[PDB]
């Protein structure tokens, strides 16, 4: 199934974009008029090998489904050792909640657009500027899990932003971020 393939690599690239947005370094990739080998969704998104490993390890050959979501947790750890959850990115899927769809490039392009939205949004949540200022009194960490969404740990009044949704013949994909707005000990 070409579609299962699309969803797998969309998940993998989602993790890459989020983790790379939290590295503390500006990201810059080049365009190519010619199709680049093993870039997906017509976006230049380089793969950090260690991140691919953790992502595949968490997925364990599964794709998102009801009650089974891919979550990327972004946290802050102080130099004293105290840890604080900053963000939970959630990639979810609906069940036999589909659309009688068109040719393959259409759904592919919609996933592409969702990754572009993710690129934009990862730069405008509070953790972005925190991640750019990391390295001394704190560091930014990530963790990936696959299962039930738990939004505890984000403190009172945490906000949620919907990055977007993509309908497919097998269900609706949804990508969102829940994020802490008050840093507190």
């Amino acid at each position: 199934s070409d579609l299962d393939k699309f969803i797998k690599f969309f998940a993998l690239k989602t993790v890459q974009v989020i983790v790379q947005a939290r590295l503390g370094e500006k990201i810059c990739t080049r365009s190519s008029s010619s199709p680049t080998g093993s870039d997906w969704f017509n976006l230049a998104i380089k793969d950090i090998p260690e991140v691919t490993h953790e992502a595949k390890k968490a997925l364990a050959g599964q794709l998102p489904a009801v009650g089974r979501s891919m979550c990327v947790e972004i946290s802050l750890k102080t130099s004293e050792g105290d840890s604080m959850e900053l963000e939970i990115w959630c990639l979810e899927m609906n069940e036999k909640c589909d659309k009688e769809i068109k040719v393959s490039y259409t759904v592919y392009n919609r996933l592409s657009l969702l990754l572009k939205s993710l690129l934009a949004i990862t730069r405008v949540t509070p953790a972005y500027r925190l991640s750019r200022k990391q390295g001394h009194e704190y560091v930014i960490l990530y963790r990936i899990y696959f299962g039930e969404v738990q939004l505890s740990g984000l403190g009172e009044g945490f906000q949620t932003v919907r990055v977007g949704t993509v309908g497919t013949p097998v269900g609706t994909i949804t990508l969102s971020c829940a994020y802490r707005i008050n840093l507190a000990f």
Binding site: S31, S32, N42, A44, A120
Partner: protein, 198 residues
């Protein structure tokens, strides 16, 4: 097909006008571009890869992502700069707006009079305010940053609500849908204009 319009409003110091406009315009163009199409005689097509680049704002506490096209960035910087100049020189209340319009060239099978039919318009309204102290300037850098975060979130949210995109073109009609004139990237056909209202 019905054309969709969106309006954003920002209040900024004069020295922030350009970066604020570029942040919005590039966020929209990031979504409204693709890789360059290369057609075969049978009508099949391959698609190039779009790079992206983080851009730090120097006058706003903000970072935006843009497509990695020097040509596109040069074009946007030129018109945004002309807009900023016009706004500064107009001697009014510091009110102006820029519009980014995506359009298709009419196909013979379409019953329209105009040669350019818009399907999306994005308007960014600006109000320029003058500050008195460095103290206020520093605060303004922070606050405008927070507002732009809200604006980008709003752009993404409305993007998801816009269901329509042009039909993918055959080789003979690609220039009715896309700007094929750049080296790196392939935007939907667009025009940028501005107004000075007061």
């Amino acid at each position: 097909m019905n054309c969709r319009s969106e309006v954003l409003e920002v209040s900024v110091e004069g020295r922030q006008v350009e970066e604020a406009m570029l942040a919005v315009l590039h966020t929209v163009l990031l979504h409204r571009s693709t890789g360059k199409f290369h057609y075969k005689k049978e009508g099949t097509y391959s698609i190039g890869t779009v790079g992206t680049q983080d851009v730090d704002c120097d006058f706003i506490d903000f970072t935006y992502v843009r497509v990695s096209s020097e040509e596109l960035d040069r074009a946007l910087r030129k018109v945004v700069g002309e807009f900023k100049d016009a706004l500064r020189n107009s001697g009014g209340d510091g009110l102006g707006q820029m519009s980014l319009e995506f359009y298709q060239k009419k196909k013979s099978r379409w019953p329209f009079s105009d040669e350019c039919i818009p399907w999306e318009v994005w308007t960014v309204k600006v109000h320029v305010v003058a500050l008195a102290t460095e103290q206020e300037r520093q605060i303004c850098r922070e606050k405008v940053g927070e507002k732009l975060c809200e604006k980008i979130i709003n752009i993404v949210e409305v993007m998801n609500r816009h269901e329509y995109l042009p039909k993918m073109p055959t080789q003979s009609e690609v220039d009715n849908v896309f700007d094929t004139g750049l080296r790196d990237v392939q935007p939907y056909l667009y025009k940028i204009s501005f107004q000075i209202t007061d």
